[PDB]
Amino acid sequence: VGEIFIYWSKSHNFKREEQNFVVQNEINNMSFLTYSVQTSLIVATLKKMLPIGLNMCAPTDQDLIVLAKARYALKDTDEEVREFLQNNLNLQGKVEGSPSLRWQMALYRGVPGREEDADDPEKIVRRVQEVSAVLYHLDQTEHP
Amino acid sequence: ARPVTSPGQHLLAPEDVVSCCLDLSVPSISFRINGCPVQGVFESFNLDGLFFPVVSFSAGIKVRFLLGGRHGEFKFLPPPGYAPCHEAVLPRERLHLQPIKEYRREGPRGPHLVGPSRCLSHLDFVPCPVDTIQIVLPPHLERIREKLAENIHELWALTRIEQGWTYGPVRDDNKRLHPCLVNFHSLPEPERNYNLQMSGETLKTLLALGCHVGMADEKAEDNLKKTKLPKTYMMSNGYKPAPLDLSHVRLTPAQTTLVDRLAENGHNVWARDRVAQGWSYSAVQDIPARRNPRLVPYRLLDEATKRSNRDSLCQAVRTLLGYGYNIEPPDQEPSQVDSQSRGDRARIFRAEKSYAVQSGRWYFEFEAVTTGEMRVGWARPELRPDVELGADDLAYVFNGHRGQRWHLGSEPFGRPWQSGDVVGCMIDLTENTIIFTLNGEVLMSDSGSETAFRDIEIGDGFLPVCSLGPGQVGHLNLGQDVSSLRFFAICGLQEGFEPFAINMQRPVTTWFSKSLPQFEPVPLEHPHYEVARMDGTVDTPPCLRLTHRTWGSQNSLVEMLFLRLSLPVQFHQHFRCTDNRDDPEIILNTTTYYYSVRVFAGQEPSCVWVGWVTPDYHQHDMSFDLSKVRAVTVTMGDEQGNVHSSLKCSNCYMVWGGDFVSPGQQGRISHTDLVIGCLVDLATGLMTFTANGKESNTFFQVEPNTKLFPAVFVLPTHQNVVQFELGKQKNIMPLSAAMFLSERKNPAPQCPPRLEVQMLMPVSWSRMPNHFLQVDTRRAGERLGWAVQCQEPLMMMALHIPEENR
Amino acid sequence: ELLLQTNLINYVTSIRPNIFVGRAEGSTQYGKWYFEVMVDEVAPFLTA
Amino acid sequence: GVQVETISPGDGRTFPKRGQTCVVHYTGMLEDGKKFDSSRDRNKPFKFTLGKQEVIRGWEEGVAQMSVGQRAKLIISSDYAYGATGHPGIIPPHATLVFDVELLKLE
């Protein structure tokens, strides 16, 4: 769903067609949810699924997600951002530094299997890449 | 506290047995200690509510209630005619021990906040049947009334065979044989006439209901066949019940609701007759003593008896339908209890103001233990306890019970909860929005927006808030133990909302709206009432004049108003043993002080009350009159007799203006002000009143060291209501001389800034203690009774306001 | 009398059995009632 | 005029005698009901020898009347107590004093 939404953001024509199709069909997107970007099913589905993706990453990964969004603003390619995060490993958030990360890590550990997840650095970097790209494109869309 | 003499006096110690006796007729309350009489009684107290046994204590005790019967064996025989209390337990409920008006309790997941409890009133035990005597049966109804009454006897006899009953010369439940079962004519005619008249009463009560019944089809009476009854169903006498049978008959839903009302009226009428005879309620049946378990109004009656009575009436209603007479259910008559104010009844719990948040994204949860009326949301720090949550602009809340969002009014939103549902409240001050989730799912308005409120102005911050209606329970989780939150992970965690108390070291303090009326200064911005401080001219003394701002205009508020002066006058510790210009020696020596009240023309003296109130006056009564005033007489005497003393205690000492209004003037609006003067002698303890110079017959006596506040209770009926006049009479000192020490000898009237008018306010904020006494209540045994225990000490630092004795 | 006073005091609580009796004209309730309390243990000064 | 009223029973046999140290807990209140002193707040029993004229006269008589283990209320008139002078800062002039005195032991 994220990749589809990134395609939506990148291609201007796809937005043209979704608007034309919704208008012509006269289909009511609000009926499905319960014309506009928020009503656009392409955006609504990603908004619904986004918490699932964020659940993938860990609170320490948030520090890296910030820098990944910065690179995506710099317009670096996906693999370029992956390599940037690969070389910028030590930038991972520190639990001791901030109190909030303490209780966030408490939850992260309490939920089973998440400690096993993110053990390998490569999965960490790919996960941060994906979530960061999705969030960056959400930022562009929400922007006028 | 008044000392009372008893043999071997001592503070209640282990192995002491205290016997309490209540006689409502006198009324009086008496005590016995270890069987020995306690030489003192309470009497002449008010009877406007229900009385219950109570024990008050601090930490460090174990006691046992002994209620007689199987709930505690009395150590001493009750005095003659005194019923054991265990009998008083109502049919619906079982006996146990309770706290009194608790605003919270414990529970497995945490502390539960509790709303007010609906409580019975002494009037609730008075049966109030609708009178059918005025009604006269229709001629057609006369024809059915008789045969139906005979059929009803046959139905009862048929039920009796199911009961296993057999004809008996004397009826014994153990015997299983009943003389009451006989053919209508076999049954004694005075007994049969009672059945016939009762069936007539049912037609008449249908008329009272207003349902209209005209017999429709004759063939319908032919269609019904009386059920054939077996000899086994027949009594030992062999009288056989012959109830008619109407399988075809069916009851309309409006008609089924009608059958409930008729049964209720029938139970209510039966109770009235038994009371007139002299019967009374008792959990244990005592026929010789005329004590019955059934003798309670229908609503209080137990459900099983309700359904039995309803079945009888339903069968009789169906028999009426079976004859063919059509009964039209009467239109539903509107009736609203309107017993209380919504805001003053529902209790509001909020966080302490210091916790108000002005930025960030915050989350908390509220589980509805009951489905009833509750509101949950965010409130501004300067929230008012009187107003209902959301009616004003200071609170944004959600009332799931009906499915509404409340702010400056109600708007449909969301869906109602069920028992055990958790509402997650989120506030986002970065975006200025508020969100509600039910069981982890965002609640959506009809328009489809996922934000309950938008364009929130941060202002002074927001606090968690919840309101509970009567008989409601809610578990509020501000999220100190993040793992305890139920749906935070499902919704609110990934979005970045933080539990309201995530990093707090101690549980968040809360305040509740305590509905104990307290006197407070009249607000300077009050829309309805204004107080003007008038300077004292040469001819007029200092005054405090009250006027109604909005009188004579639509939206004006007219209700009883209780006013007092901010400072008291205190009687001396020890009472004395046994021109128009004041004389100097007399004015210096006098211990009498005076103040008056001027009721302006056009204000009803019948609506005015004038006098004094003691510090512990907390009655906010819209229907106030001198009969409501609390009062009780403590009488102390020797065991042989010879009452030593009798002291009358009250919190209100006032005279009614109707007493002073002349009989001719009564019913007519006078054009002259009424001046009522109040005199108190601090050394003597005597209180007198005068009306327009003349002396009233009312006088009061108070004990030494008492504090009295000047007070006026008035129902406004004019733009200018009343005036507190702080002056003097010849050779009598003004009130300021008593109020202030520096002016003790100054005879010039004056009203310093501290002296102001205060009005009774129904509700006020109060702080919930962080810890509560741990009381254990159980039943030690059938012989031992019920046990109360509290062992762990608990103390607080109390701040005392000397003038208000609070 | 002028300055606010402070002191430490014990918390106090009340307990009742769910028994209610009153008097009203035509009321079904009985008039006279009786009950007892037996004191098993008391600590005269558990605190100050 | 000191008036003694039993609150809890004592042995009824042991009474303080001159030169014998009395150990007590007391809580003092003014007649109108304000508390000014309390040994329990300090958490240390008050000790005094009878006849030393070190406690006030109302106490002398009241404790002399009490018996070991007894708890009593002593109402002490002004002229028995500090009296017209009073205790500046603590007790107003001409104030009757009510004490809740328990006599723990004699030594």
Ligand SMILES: Nc1ncnc2c1ncn2[C@@H]1O[C@H](COP(=O)(O)OP(=O)(O)OP(=O)(O)O)[C@@H](O)[C@H]1O
């Ligand atoms: N409260 C009542 N309302 C209406 N009918 C009643 C009521 N109590 C009894 N009856 C009926 O009155 C008739 C006589 O009463 P019943 O045979 O039950 O006599 P009882 O057992 O001596 O007295 P009770 O049952 O009233 O204590 C029976 O038909 C019974 O069904």
